[PDB]
Design a protein around this ligand. Structure first.
Ligand SMILES: CCCCCCCCCCCCCC(=O)O
Ligand SMILES: CCCCCCCCCCCCCC(=O)O
Ligand SMILES: CCCCCCCCCCCCCC(=O)O
Ligand SMILES: CCCCCCCCCCCCCC(=O)O
Ligand SMILES: CCCCCCCCCCCCCC(=O)O
Lengths: 178, 252, 29, 285, 178, 252, 285, 29, 29
């Protein structure tokens, strides 16, 4: 998908098995795939971060396509949830698709220390955010059986970066000439 | 209702019964140049309603394989009535804009367009050394550019939508004034942008201040593909004013 | 220039050269 | 108080971040978590709205994230070389068309904005390599030649007289030279990007090369020819001061290839050209 | 003409074709032929300039010689006018020769940027000043059929130079000895 | 001195060191249309300095046999910068004018030109029944008409200067705003005329409000006839305003 | 206010330029554009009088165009050479008859006025070239010998005692020497030009050589003879301070040929001797 | 010499040597 | 910063840099 707009979309569709997993990524602001987002790029210019993160999702199926999804944040000290039941025991939002296309899940700052390192460090790995089918993707007849979802990220009022440093998300391997 | 909008400019009025609010670029409404920021000393001409009206460009067709489209301002309006005349008879010009992108489908359709207004969208060329995009290519007029069609040439600009045609990632275009046309939600996008530049006025012939970029981030899909789904763009200058009158400049 | 303040905690914001470009980093806000 | 503001500067607590307030369970037809990204606005929902939060007093400050701070660090922009190989008269002087486009690190930071206005602090780090053993007494001259001024073509060119241009003379053993330059543009701000040309024909130039002419930096070893050959490398560092920036933009995602242009190269496997790391699948963290 | 006083004069005479062009030069204060004028020489000691320019012309024919001329300033973004019609569409002055021998045309500061470079630079090339016959050069019988015109230049109240630099209008190629 | 005059309009300034005062048609200085007299309800566009400036027409040569010349307004300015553009993009237009006729000779020359501004100069045809002057003939543009040259045609208008090209005697043209250019006295004529019509605004394409007529009533004479003596006309619209914007009208 | 004037100095806004006011169409028998250059005066017409101008607030300042600024930049006026070739006693000292006539750049600027009064800041840039490898310990002595004082004829001449004359001793490795000199003339101002002689016969001298005697600068390497030969070049820089100038004049249009004289050389094709560039014709821009 | 001004923005125009020729560039006007 | 005291024995506790980390050893108690 890299090199294509499709790298930004997640496909949803009618499921035959219940509570299927849709996606899973680390919450760490400068880890992949969050790294190249604007907030991830800026975070990569600093050594420490703190605060809550705002993850938003916009459903892009037809207006007659319905769906309920469960977005969960799993605080650290445990592996990523292996099932919806395991995931919902943590922080989560049950999203019902309707007139309003977008939902937001806030990943609260839940840490032992006041700050965490922006670069991939065990001790300060913030946890995971997973997505699961709460009910199912449903459509009337004569309607596309798949739909896309867009994912956004930004920082809440308490977000903050500290200790300026050079980024490792960009390099120079030769002279830049005229 | 907050789903409705009516925009009146000069002798034109545009409506939409399914909008997603409107965006005012950088929170600044367009306004005329003040004497504190002005530099050119001749009295500016302000066509008012004969130039500050909606001009509708050639429509484009959106299909399952579309990679996107872009236009540059004021270039796109170079042949639009009084506004166009003024930008060639004067050395300097200044203007804000109301951009209204239109695209209706059906409730059984799905698709998403990212509509963005980029200031100083300096295009790149790919694998061509220090050779830059040629004037002709960045001045396509109301026809704009259909990404993924143009038959290559040396001075031809990048056509990579995921790299914003300039070496940066598409996902971050949201940092610029923008809206989305998500077929299940709205059938139009409205962006009002002020004049943005490091100088109070500038040549409208050799400097494109803004670029309108439309990228389908979610493929157009439905069970009635034979029905063509166009995208139409209507742009209205705002507070257009020009200075440095002379003969009409002829390009090429 | 010396922008002497008072509170006693006296602040001495000194500008050693006669050009604005010569001074150090700007204050925030 | 100019003294209370002073204390905040020393402690770096000028820009404080909001506290988190205690929240409670809710049951309402007002759903803050729901919105419409189509509007082009970011949902302003905060943690208190999605979970039951405790009260916490924030102590974090945004001072270090200020534009002044971000662009206020001195970085290398040029590495001038004067290598005496076999002809002192030809190799003891050189010139450089000034710009901030040749070094990726600082270029990328400034290019995160469309326009920027600032004064500049230039610091020079000269290092004399003794190729034959001795360095003797090295005295350098760095002359700022604004566009239009005569450019020296020999090491004894009359232009080195510097009757009007600013020149900095450095003596080996003395501290690193440094001077300030005021915002230099003929416009209100520097163009980090410029979607325009210097004409309207197929042969007109495109981009910032059209608007960003800063003149030339002419250097020479003042000392006359010595028995032992040396290689003097002067590294130029730039730091923005009293800075303002406008219209933020996406960070450079691929390597730079040339100055004053956004051009880039792409390989057959594009994932190698960007910092994005391929994921095994959607559910593999 | 260089090396002769005639390099400072422009000849006028009865025309057989209407609206003939008399002269044309760039308005740029430090470009040629403006370069060696006093204001041009001073401008050559600076990197930037701004403000309006004052061009004056003194007719030197006999007191019985009449003439009407059109002096025009063509703002940039277009080539120099190829005809009187094309030129008069810009800023201009129609000069009628009479008891008062001199006329002045002011080239207003019409620029995108607050300043321009004094050295020949495309982006900041200020335009042209051209001269055309408005009617014709007319004389009674027994009167010289040609006459000279002198041209002057100076800066208006808003003229200003900036960023001191060494001049390229003078050089030293050897030692100045005793 | 009362012999001198300087007229500044927009970016143009005209001078004369030998004038015969100036005439203000019917004693009314041009002014914009008021809401009490207006009828068209859309907001007018007022180009101001980009249209209200001096436009110099093609010069004419005056010789011992010249019978005269005439131009019609706004026709004569149809191809003059912004003013011209505006009169074709709009259905309605309204404007006043400053007409400055130039003609210098020598003190040993003699000749007299009658310069007149005629409202509704409805031209006649001679010995052609009820066939009237054709559109093309009364819309010659900046070239105007040289009396006594045009090779006859059926729709060709009268060319009798002594009958004012309309069946009335030349001697009575003085009842209209006018001046004389008597070579021994002045080298120019200046007439400022207001908008005159039975309607507040009108089509600038099919209705010529004023006609500039120049008739040499006293033959040009001197003892140096080889020296050509031209006549140049410079006209500056005043308070030009237009209404009813649309596409640009193309004539013929 | 001495504090408000201080702010203007830092911002360089002491001398502001007038604004442009809005103007309107005019019809009058007063014609500002018409005048008579025969009077010897410049028409004072401004843009508001020839076109319809808008109102614009000027922000430009004339500070940098001040005489103090124009002549207040340090430029090279002399390049003293002490080249040890084969006789230390003869080659380790030298002298220079002081003047500002030998370097074109600063000479031309001062010569744009007929008279000038100012104090002088002299800065010296010495550079020791190691011809044989080492430079040892170089100590220099620069003595100002006013006209009349004994001029040294050997490196150990008693005059080097400098019992009254001012001498500056520089040690290699220490910062560049610098000192100030007060306006030195026996008159009220320095003559940039002098249409006079030092007598009334065919053999009397003509020009500024008659009025501009500034004495001599005598230099020597204080260090006694060393094994390794060196070439010490001391460049002298001059800057005018607290300056006043009178009666501006045409700038030098041809190269200078000699000191204290306006003499010049002309080739067979004079357009090569002046900065004027031949035009193809009157209408070719 | 110290030409101390007051406004608080105190200006310290210091002359380190005892000769007029020693001071820096002159003020304008 | 200058924390000027008075008693006359004036104390001038000067902080030459704008960061707390830059100052010298702390006072006791
Ligand atoms: C009142 C006591 C005199 C203290 C000496 C002041 C030392 C600081 C000099 C800095 C001068 C900056 C220029 C002013 O403004
Ligand atoms: C002796 C070198 C002068 C040092 C460099 C000064 C740089 C300041 C200008 C910054 C303008 C940025 C635009 C660009 O990319 O060229
Ligand atoms: C050790 C050198 C003393 C440095 C030079 C001081 C120059 C100041 C005098 C200026 C008088 C100008 C007249 C001239 O051209 O000779
Ligand atoms: C009142 C506090 C004493 C501050 C010490 C002053 C330091 C500046 C010394 C400069 C002396 C210049 C000569 C006088 O006049
Ligand atoms: C009132 C006389 C001025 C004395 C000059 C002050 C010299 C000390 C400067 C130290 C500045 C520290 C920064 C402040 O705070």
């Amino acid at each position: 998908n890299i090199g294509n707009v499709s790298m930004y979309t997640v496909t949803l569709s009618p499921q035959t098995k219940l509570a299927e997993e849709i996606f899973a990524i680390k919450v760490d602001i400068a880890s992949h795939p969050l790294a190249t987002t604007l907030i991830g790029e800026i975070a990569s210019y600093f050594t420490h971060w703190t605060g809550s993160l705002r993850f938003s999702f916009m459903f892009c199926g037809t207006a007659n396509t319905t769906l309920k999804v469960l977005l969960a944040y799993t605080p650290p000290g445990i592996g990523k949830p292996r099932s919806r039941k395991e995931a919902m025991l943590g922080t989560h939002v049950v999203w019902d698709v309707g007139l309003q296309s977008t939902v937001s899940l806030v990943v609260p700052w839940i840490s032992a220390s006041q700050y965490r390192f922006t670069t991939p460090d065990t001790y300060s790995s913030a946890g995971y955010i997973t997505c699961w089918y709460q009910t199912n993707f449903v459509v009337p007849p004569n309607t596309p059986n798949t739909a896309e979802m867009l994912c956004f990220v930004s920082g809440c009022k308490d977000f903050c970066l500290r200790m300026a440093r050079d980024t490792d998300l960009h390099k120079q391997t030769g002279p830049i000439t005229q | 209702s907050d789903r409705i909008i009516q925009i009146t400019r000069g002798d034109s009025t545009i409506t939409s019964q399914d909008v997603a609010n409107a965006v005012v670029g950088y929170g600044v409404w367009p306004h005329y140049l003040t004497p504190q920021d002005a530099t050119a000393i001749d009295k500016p001409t302000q066509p008012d309603t004969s130039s500050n009206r909606f001009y509708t460009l050639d429509s484009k067709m959106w299909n399952s394989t579309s990679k996107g489209w872009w236009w540059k301002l004021p270039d796109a309006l170079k042949d639009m009535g009084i506004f166009g005349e003024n930008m060639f008879y004067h050395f300097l010009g200044r203007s804000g804009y109301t951009v209204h992108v239109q695209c209706n489908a059906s409730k059984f359709h799905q698709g998403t367009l990212l509509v963005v207004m980029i200031p100083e969208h300096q295009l790149a060329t790919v694998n061509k050394g220090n050779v830059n995009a040629g004037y002709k290519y960045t001045h396509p007029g109301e026809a704009g550019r259909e990404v993924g069609t143009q038959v290559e040439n040396e001075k031809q600009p990048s056509d990579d939508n995921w790299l914003n045609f300039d070496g940066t990632l598409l996902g971050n275009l949201l940092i610029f004034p923008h809206q989305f046309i998500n077929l299940r939600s709205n059938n139009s996008a409205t962006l009002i942008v002020p004049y943005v530049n490091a100088v109070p006025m500038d040549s409208m012939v050799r400097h494109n201040n803004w670029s309108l970029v439309i990228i389908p981030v979610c493929q157009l899909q439905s069970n009635n593909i034979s029905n063509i789904v166009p995208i139409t763009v209507s742009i209205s200058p705002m507070c257009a004013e020009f200075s440095g009158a002379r003969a009409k400049t002829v390009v090429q | 220039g010396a922008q002497v303040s008072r509170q006693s905690l006296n602040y001495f914001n000194i500008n050693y050269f006669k050009d604005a470009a010569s001074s150090g980093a700007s204050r925030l806000d | 108080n100019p003294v209370e503001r002073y204390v905040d500067e020393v402690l770096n607590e000028v820009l404080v971040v909001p506290n988190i307030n205690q929240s409670h369970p809710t049951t309402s037809n007002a759903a803050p978590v729901l919105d419409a990204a189509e509007t082009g606005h970011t949902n302003k929902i905060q943690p208190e709205d999605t979970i039951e939060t405790r009260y916490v007093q924030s102590s974090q400050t945004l001072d270090e994230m200020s534009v002044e701070s971000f662009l206020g660090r001195s970085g290398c922009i040029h590495e001038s070389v004067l290598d005496i190989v076999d002809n002192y008269n030809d190799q003891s002087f050189t010139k450089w068309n000034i710009n901030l486009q040749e070094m990726a690190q600082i270029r990328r930071k400034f290019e995160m904005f469309t326009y920027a206005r600032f004064d500049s602090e230039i610091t020079m780090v000269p290092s004399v390599a003794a190729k034959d053993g001795h360095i003797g007494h090295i005295v350098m001259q760095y002359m700022y030649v604004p566009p239009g001024a005569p450019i020296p073509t020999t090491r004894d060119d009359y232009a080195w007289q510097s009757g009007t241009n600013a020149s900095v003379f450095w003596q080996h053993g003395q501290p690193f030279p440094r001077f300030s330059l005021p915002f230099l543009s003929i416009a209100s701000a520097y163009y980090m990007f410029y979607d325009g040309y210097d004409g309207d024909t197929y042969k007109s130039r495109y981009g910032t090369v059209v608007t960003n002419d800063m003149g030339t930096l002419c250097s020479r070893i003042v000392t006359s020819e010595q028995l032992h050959k040396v290689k003097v490398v002067t590294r130029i560092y730039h730091k923005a001061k009293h800075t303002k920036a406008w219209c933020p933009r996406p960070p450079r995602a691929v390597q730079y290839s040339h100055t004053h242009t956004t051009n880039y190269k792409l390989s057959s496997e594009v994932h190698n050209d960007v910092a994005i790391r391929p994921r095994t699948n959607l559910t593999t963290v």
